[PDB]
Structure 1
Amino acid sequence: SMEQVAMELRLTELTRLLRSVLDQLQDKDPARIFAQPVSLKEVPDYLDHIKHPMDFATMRKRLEAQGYKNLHEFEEDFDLIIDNCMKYNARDTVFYRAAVRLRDQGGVVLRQARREVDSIG
């Protein structure tokens, strides 16, 4: 149907905007602490601690399959990155501190993304 095509064009354009959001959030992680999944070879107990692991590469795979239907879904995954790190790692660690700085900096980006998603519809 033509309606299905129009809905698909909306999804594609959301995907465009989320890709730009993702790039901007990932620049706030210059150490690449959140770039890849936590390695279960190197942290064998990880899944005993963290039930829904997340990282920027995993988000990018979902994004490129157009697997985010709305900004809320994308933000859920971003918050998992931060929240998982702040639980597994102690306050005095470079990992925890990195997550705090990512959350703080990403807030700015996400704030305007929400306005854009609503504005462009």
Structure 2
Amino acid sequence: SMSVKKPKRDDSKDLALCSMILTEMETHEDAWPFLLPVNLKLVPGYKKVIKKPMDFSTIREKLSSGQYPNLETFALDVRLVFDNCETFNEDDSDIGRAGHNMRKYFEKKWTDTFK
């Protein structure tokens, strides 16, 4: 509350560390469904069904231009990429499986880097 603060967690490396995580996501072999925005002209249903499209290139541009106020807003956009994938793709598909694998990969890097 006013003039009563919890001890200051060091957040000065968060930007660099989120960039490293995102690099590792970009270079994973199952990243290919997620590297670029879904083409809304060429994928029937996507525009109407997926209210907030997100992809790694879009996260990379937001990261690079100071559009994440903190590390939690960054994790929300990464998770959105996988939540979107699960909304649109059967679990038993190459893309569905890719999404589950990437989410698992991300969540471990996240816990190990920050928790």
Task: Normalising by structure 1, report the TM-score.
Answer: 0.78
Given residue 50 of structure 2, which amino acid in structure 1 is its aligned partner? I
Q: Share of identical aligned residues, percent? A: 32
Q: Secondary structure at the match of 1:43?
A: coil
Matches within 5 A, 1:1-121: 13-115=13-115
Structure 2 unaligned spans of 5+: 1-9
Q: Does the 8 A contact of 1:25 with 1:102 survive in 2? A: yes
Q: What do residues 8-66 of structure 1 show as CA deviations (whole Å, max 9, x unaligned)? A: xx887432221111112223344511000000121142121100000000001100002
More helix by share: 1
1:109 Cα deviation from its structure 2 partner: 0.4
Structure 1 unaligned spans of 5+: 1-9, 116-121
Partners of 2:43 and 2:26 lie apart in 1 by: 23
Q: CA RMSD in A?
A: 1.9
Q: What do residues 59-99 of structure 1 show as CA deviations (whole Å, max 9, x unaligned)? A: 01100002112111011000010010011011221111000
Task: Normalising by structure 2, report the TM-score.
Answer: 0.82
